[PDB]
Amino acid sequence: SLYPIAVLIDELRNEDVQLRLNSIKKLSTIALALGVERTRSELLPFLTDTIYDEDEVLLALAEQLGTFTTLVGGPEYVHCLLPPLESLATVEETVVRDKAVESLRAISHEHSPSDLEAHFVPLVKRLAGGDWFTSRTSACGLFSVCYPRVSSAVKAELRQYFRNLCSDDTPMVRRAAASKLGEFAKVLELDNVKSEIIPMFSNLASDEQDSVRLLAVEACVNIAQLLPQEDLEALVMPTLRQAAEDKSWRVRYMVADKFTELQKAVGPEITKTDLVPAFQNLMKDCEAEVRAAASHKVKEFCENLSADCRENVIMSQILPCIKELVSDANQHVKSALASVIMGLSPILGKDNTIEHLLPLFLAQLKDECPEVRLNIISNLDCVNEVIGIRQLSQSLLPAIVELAEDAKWRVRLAIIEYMPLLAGQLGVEFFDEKLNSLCMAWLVDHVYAIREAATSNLKKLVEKFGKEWAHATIIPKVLAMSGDPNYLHRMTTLFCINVLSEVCGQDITTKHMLPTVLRMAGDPVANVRFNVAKSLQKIGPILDNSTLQSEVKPILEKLTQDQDVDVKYFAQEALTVLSLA
Amino acid sequence: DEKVFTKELDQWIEQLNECKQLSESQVKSLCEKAKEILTKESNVQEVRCPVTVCGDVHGQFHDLMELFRIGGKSPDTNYLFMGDYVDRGYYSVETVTLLVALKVRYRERITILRGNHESRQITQVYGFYDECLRKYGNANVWKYFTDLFDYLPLTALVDGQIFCLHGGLSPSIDTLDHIRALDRLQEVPHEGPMCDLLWSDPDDRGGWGISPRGAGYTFGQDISETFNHANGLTLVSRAHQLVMEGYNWCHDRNVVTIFSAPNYCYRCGNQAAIMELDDTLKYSFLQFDPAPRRGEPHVTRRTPDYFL
Amino acid sequence: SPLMHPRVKEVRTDSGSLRRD
Amino acid sequence: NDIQWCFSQVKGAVDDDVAEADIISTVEFNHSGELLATGDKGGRVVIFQQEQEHSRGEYNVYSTFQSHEPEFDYLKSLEIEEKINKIRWLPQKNAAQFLLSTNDKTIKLWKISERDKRPEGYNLKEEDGRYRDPTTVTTLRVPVFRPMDLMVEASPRRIFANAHTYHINSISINSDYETYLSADDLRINLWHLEITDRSFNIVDIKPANMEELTEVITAAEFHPNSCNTFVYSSSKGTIRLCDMRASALCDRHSKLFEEPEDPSNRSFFSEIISSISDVKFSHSGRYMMTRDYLSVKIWDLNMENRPVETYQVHEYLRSKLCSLYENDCIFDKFECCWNGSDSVVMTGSYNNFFRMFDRNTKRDITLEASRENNKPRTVLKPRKVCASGKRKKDEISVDSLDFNKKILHTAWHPKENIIAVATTNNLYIFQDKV
Ligand SMILES: [Fe+2]
Ligand SMILES: [Zn+2]
């Protein structure tokens, strides 16, 4: 019974990457078969340093090594897994190093505090003090998991070691330290956070490398979430103000991208005093990316403002900046604004929305960019309950008409998908009065994808508006295409009947579309004929058994005698599926 | 039984629809059965209206999917391709495999003609041989496909009024019976009527001429008009020449060139087109643009995430 | 009337004839 | 006063008509100086290592691999050359060594590592390879690593391809240990060292209408210290310094370094000899050096209207520009490099001559890289070139110069006085006299 285990063990030396990978992923079976002491003394030394350096093999090995706590002899001997993971935490591949660090953190919880101070802490010190910055980068991620469960002297040593990493010469080590600064500070005492974490945060935030400075914004958020509100101004606020006006556009982009988190962390008073001018300057930034990032946060930032003076601030400070953003030259800035500007109506109120937001909506609805118009249309639900869609339909209809007849068929496809929501919001009467012709004209479009999308949209519309409206308006119109000289439109009629059978009910299907389907079985084009066969197969369950045995079965039988092979095959398949014969 | 193979062929088709190559045994069986089907296929195959005529694809699988989106999916839409399914494309193998699978499954619905670029000599130079070698590690699949390429029909006739072929007319060819008399079950020759039918081009110069491609002849409006009057052909479809607007009329609406590869060679930035023939032989062209794909490494002027 | 750099003319000519058939 | 240069080593074939595959096309020291990599037109990178016993050891072969293979552009029916254009070392991450090698179209990241142990042991097959009895497997055995003779393995880790329309001419690694740039004739792309499926195009000077091209990008380089500053030179003799902090796209330049052209030297070839073939930042980062066909110009980064120092590499060829135009010798792309302390600069010339200019003392020395003095620890005799006639004693006449012997690629040891000079086929290494 040991033969498969012997095969797996010898597969670790195989030159084939796939076989060696498969053997790696079954290391649990090998360890279980070998035992415990044999696993510790034979398998682990072999897996300590592997000559093969394939990224996926090393990644799989790193994943497996984090679950061998029981297979090596329980938590008592968990320190035996340290060498293989320490070797993996040094390789050049970033994902392998991250997986090794994650496994080390996962198995660190099984260490007793004595084992933590005897084996894990020396490992962290060796990694932090190593000659290769790949080791030092990995060491930054292991401070938070061993700090809470050590003595005071070990805590001071760990703090000193982390302080040394933040002043490293290699930019990657400093980047890792900046990344892990917040999660490290989350476990220190508040006094030590003020005394030691703040100087490191200030030093990293004023680093020469732009890639290091932009990582201080997340650290800023994490540190602000810890300190008391009265201590924010003296410690965190100057760094945040410096970051908001930083020379590099990447740092300003990071500030704008995490602006709502900063607003939540610092509180309402600091938000009103300092963050509002920062947002005003960010929306007027000279970089298009920064303006686009700040545009996304307009709605949330306005929502989270203090209710004491929310409307006044929005009117006197944010609204002019928004007005300047509507006329922006960058397409992406306008696209980003259009998707969030539409929801400021509930905050401002009906009269304020009519006076101020309505001109902005009208101006953005006439933009040359299709995506701006699509974004404005897609979010009408925010204002639908504030001012009503009656005040908006007169300007929405021209925009919908323009989008529905765009030269690019993908724009027409995009506007189609929003029609059921638009029809639901605008009401059935307005749809029948204005939008019915647009929907019908899509079924005869040259592009087949548009016809398919219009068919699915018609199914959604009938689902929304019920069967009676469909039978009254659409069904008499869709069956008119059966007389189209082009066979593509006839097959479109078949497809529309296919999707409408599931919703229109058995009675309507039998009385209105079944006679049309049966009449088209005599179409000269074989494509229409076997499409009729497939349609009869599909809508077969909806029809009654009496109708199936009376009129459907003879029609299917006649199709089985057709000259075309495809028609015969599809008719036979329909007969087999319906079990008529 | 035929039914189990029918479901097998179907599953092959859906597998290919998402750009997934078939196994060597599957390719062997597909090529053998396509050869069996194409053995009885005539040199001038009669194509019955309605049908959609497509031009060069040249291995652009995603553009082929865009073509299917624009014009409809087989077997709902009858198609008629005019050669050049491989070469100068990242997915020549997938494209030709999907086309052959569709031909085997729907022999009455899809008709595939023969162009210049599906031959042992051409495919060794323009990357199809290299593509199959890099994706399979052996020339067996190349041998299967090149053996199958010999059986593809040279020309097609649509209701006896529209003549569809890859290259164009030949000095040695005057009647459809001449094409029917040829032996197409061979490698593409360097000369002769068979070579001209896959290498000729239209030109404004009267009479005949020499072709700078290295083979074939260039024919003028007089030759096309004489051929149309002799064979009673209202129109002569064509392909094999890149055009920016997708379809191009020439020789006073006697020869039309159709190109179905948008952004030819990923650099030309051209439009593609397909000719749709109504039930009443009413021609209508549908131009389309390259499918939106991120692409092999996407060089963008938008700041990527790693720099953001 | 100084002559142009070879790389300029090579790039110009190579990109000009990108529709050869 | 001057540095005494002595012949140390020569690498390559001896007195043969080498084919167009052993011609060295790039020479580059690594950051610590103990590794020296050379690429040739055959796509074959050879790495030398200094012996361990100032460090005045010799260089011996350390690794050899085929970087780029010949390839065919099926999209345009052109052969893609496998010639190695540039080689750039990465800072040492771990025991392994990394470098970037580029041909005209593709940049490859190569890892050089040493393997000195081999797994020995099996459970179903003897060490020779014979298959053992399947019923003799009673106890499982785990393979155990065993020491072996050290071997050096080079493998490609990442491929950055299909992103440049034109021929790549420069690669430079950023100082943030994260990104690097590759510049073709008209565009500059910013890459990530661990991401190959996308690149960021920061500079694009290609006009919409291309029948009015006037210049192309000939070189590019990041600042040695600053992570946001890089420069790129054009064929018109202008260097543009771009700041990546101002905007995401660097289509507008922060500074423009150019010297107004006096109509005195307004010859027919004044546009060719003014093209910049190489731009190099000083190690301190406060100075920038550019090399055109006839001169070396050192630019102060705070002064844009004129260079601070100008050195004439070979003035005697100014009057013979017409002759050099006929045999395509006027289109050569020479290079230049700084020394460790940014005090001496060395650049190549014709007839196996390489020139060295001392910035502190304003002194010039011309030396010959020749096999005629193939004796180690031999002081190189300075060379002097005279015009036609007046050959004095040791004067080399201009008409006797061999223009087929060009020293295009040179390198300096980052810390020591060791220079690598690459002739057409051989690689010469010279050392200071100690
Ligand atoms: Fe062709
Ligand atoms: Zn073609």
Nearest residue to D417 via CA among D37, D5, D30 = D5
Chains that touch A (3 or more CB pairs under 8 A): B, D
Sign of the CA dihedral with A536 first, then B52, B129, and B91 last = negative
Q: How far is A527 from chain B (nearest CA, A)?
A: 6
Residues D257 and D298: their CA atoms lie apart, in Å, by: 11
d(CA A335, CA A373): 8
Task: Report CA D415 to chain centroid distance, whole Å.
Answer: 17
Q: Do residues B112 and B260 lie in contact, with contact meaning Cβ atoms separated by under 8 Å? A: no
Q: What is the DSSP letter of A315?
A: I
Helix (H, G, I), strand (E, B) or coil at B65: helix
Residue A166 per-residue DSSP state: H
Residues of B with CB under 8 A from a CB of D: 87-88, 126-127, 130, 265-267, 296-301, 303-304, 306-307
B59 vs B72: CA distance, rounded Å: 19
The whole-angstrom separation of Cα A552 and Cα A514 is: 9
CA nearest to A408, candidates A448, A377, A441, A370: A370
Q: How far is the CA of B82 from the centre of ligand 2 (A)?
A: 9
CA of A353 to the centre of ligand 2 (A): 59
CA distance B43 to B183: 8
For D244, the token pair is: 């990546």
> How is A257-293 classified by DSSP, letter by letter?
HTHHHHHHHH-HHHIIIIIHHHHHHHHT-SSHHHHHH
CB atoms within 10 A of CB A33: 17
Query: Do B104 and B34 touch, CB atoms closer than 8 A?
Result: yes
- Look up tokens 């068919």; give the residue: A455
Measured distance CA(B112)–CA(B116) in Å, rounded: 13
Dist. CA D414–CA A69, nearest whole Å: 48
State the DSSP string of A498-567.
HHHHHHHHHHHIIIIIHHHHHHGGG-SSHHHHHHHHHHHHHTTTTS-HHHIIIIIHHHHHHHTT-SSHHH
Question: Is residue D69 assigned to a domain?
Answer: no
Nearest CA among D57, D35, D43, D47 for reference residue D11: D47
Question: Which tokens is D143 given?
Answer: 């393979």
- Cβ–Cβ under 8 Å, residues B175 and B190: no
**Whole-angstrom Cα distance, residue A62 to residue A101?**
9
State in Å: Cα B241 to ligand 2 middle.
Answer: 6
Q: Which residues of D249-270 are buried (b: 16+ CB within 10 A; e: fewer)?
A: bbeebebebbeeeeeeeeeebe
Residues of B in contact with A250 (CB under 8 A): 307-308
User: If you count residue pairs, one on B and one on D, with CB atoms under 8 Å apart, how many are there?
Assistant: 52
Residue D386 to chain A, least CA–CA distance (Å)? 51
E-strand ranges in chain B read 44-47, 51-54, 79-81, 110-112, 155-158, 162-165, 201-202, 218-219, 235-238, 247-250, 255-258, 272-277, 283-288, 298-300
Taking the CA atoms of A571, A572, A577 and A580 in sequence, report the sign of the dihedral they define. Answer: positive
D217, containing H or E segment: strand D217-222
* Pair B188, B194: CB distance under 8 Å: yes
User: For residues B155 and B46, what is the distance between their CA atoms, to the nearest angstrom?
Assistant: 9
Tokens of B184: 């197409």
Cα–Cα nearest to D355, from D344, D339, D367: D367
Residue D89 lies in a domain: no
The SS3 assignment for A36 reads: coil
Residue in C closest to B263 by C-alpha: C19
User: Domain containing B201: what range?
Assistant: 7-288
Interatomic CA distance for residues B147 and B138, integer angstroms: 15
Is D178 in contact with A172 (Cβ distance < 8 A)? yes
DSSP string, A396-444: HHHHHHHHHT-SSHHHHHHHHHTHHHHHHHH-HHHIIIIIHHHHHHHTT
Using only C-alpha atoms, chain C has a radius of gyration, in whole angstroms, of: 11
| Residue type for position B150 | D
Between D189, D192, D195, which is nearest B299 by CB? D189
Instruction: Read off φ and ψ for residue B101, nearest 5 degrees.
Output: -65, -45
SS3 for D241?
strand
Give residue for tokens 């003014």. Answer: D274
Please name the method used to determine this structure: cryo-EM
- How many domains does chain B contain in total? 1
Round to whole Å and give the CA distance between A244 and A252: 6
Q: How many domains does the structure of chain D reveal?
A: 1
Q: Token digits for A391? A: 């005040």
Which ligand is the nearest neighbour of the Cα of C21?
A: 2
Q: Extract the annotated binding site of B for Mn(2+).
A: 56, 58, 84, 116, 166, 240
Q: Phi and psi of A578, rounded to 5°?
A: -75, -10
D104 within a domain of the structure (yes/no): no
Protein residues placing their CB within 5 Å of the ion ligand 1: B 84, 115-117, 240
Note whether B231 and B219 are within 8 A (CB).
no
**DSSP states along A326-357:** HT-S-HHHHHHHHHHHTT-HHHH-HHHIIIII
Nearest to A263 by CA among A248, A282, A250, A278: A278
Instruction: Say if CB A235 and CB A220 are below 8 A apart.
Output: no
Q: Which residues of D touch A91 (CB under 8 A)?
A: 94
Host domain of residue D233: 5-38+160-432
Q: Tokens for D162, please give them.
A: 């299909």
Residues D7 and D428: their CA atoms lie apart, in Å, by: 8
Q: What are the catalytic residues of B?
A: 117
| Touching, A vs C (3+ Cβ pairs under 8 A) | no
C-alpha span between B116 and D108 (Å, rounded): 37
> Any residues with CB less than 8 A from the CB of D18 and at least 6 apart, and which?
D12, D424, D425
Cβ neighbours for D337, distance < 8 A, ≥ 6 positions apart: D280, D345, D346, D347, D410, D411, D412
Q: How many CB atoms lie within 10 A of CB A405?
A: 13
**Residues paired with D279 in a beta bridge:** D290
Numbered residues of chain B with Cβ closer than 8 Å to any chain A Cβ: 6, 50, 69-73, 75-78, 106-109, 278-280, 286, 288-289, 292, 302-303, 307-308
Is residue B162 classed as helix, strand or coil in its secondary structure? Answer: strand
Length of chain C: 21
Q: What is the Cβ-side half-sphere exposure of residue D417, based on CA atoms within 13 angstroms?
A: 14
- Angle of CA points A256, A261, A263, to nearest 5°: 85
Q: Is D195 on the interface with B (CB under 8 A)?
A: yes
Per-domain residue ranges for chain A? 484-581
Cα B158 from Cα B178, distance rounded (Å):
18
Please enumerate, by residue number, every residue of B annotated as part of a binding site.
Answer: 56, 58, 84, 116, 166, 240
What is A484-581's CATH topology? Answer: Leucine-rich Repeat Variant (1.25.10)
- Of residues B72, B280, B288, nearest to A485 (C-beta): B280
C-alpha to C-alpha distance for A320 and A314, rounded to whole angstroms: 9
Radius of gyration of chain A (CA): 34
Contact D37, D99 (CB under 8 A): yes
Distance of CA D13 to the CA centre of its chain: 21
Given the structure tokens 């003609």, which residue do they identify? Answer: B113
Q: Which contiguous run of DSSP H or E holds residue D154? A: strand D144-160
Paired tokens of D305? 């209207």
Residue A481 DSSP class: G
Report residue B179: phi and psi, to 5°.
-65, -40
Q: What is the CB neighbour count within 10 angstroms for residue A237? A: 18
Q: A549-567: b or e for each residue (b if 16 or more CB lie within 10 Å)?
A: eeebbebbeebbebebebb
Residue whose token pair is 């009654």: A544
CA pair distance D419, D347, nearest whole angstrom: 11
3-class state of residue D268 by DSSP = coil
**Domain CATH for D261:** 2.130.10.10
Domain containing residue B204: CATH number: 3.60.21.10
- The residues, ordered by sequence, that sit 6+ positions from A23 with a Cβ below 8 Å of its Cβ are A8, A9, A11, A12, A14, A30
Tell me, in angstroms, the distance from the centre of ligand 1 to residue B123's CA: 12
**Crossing angle (nearest 10°) for helices A276-283 and A259-266:** 170
Contact B242 C18 (CB under 8 A): no
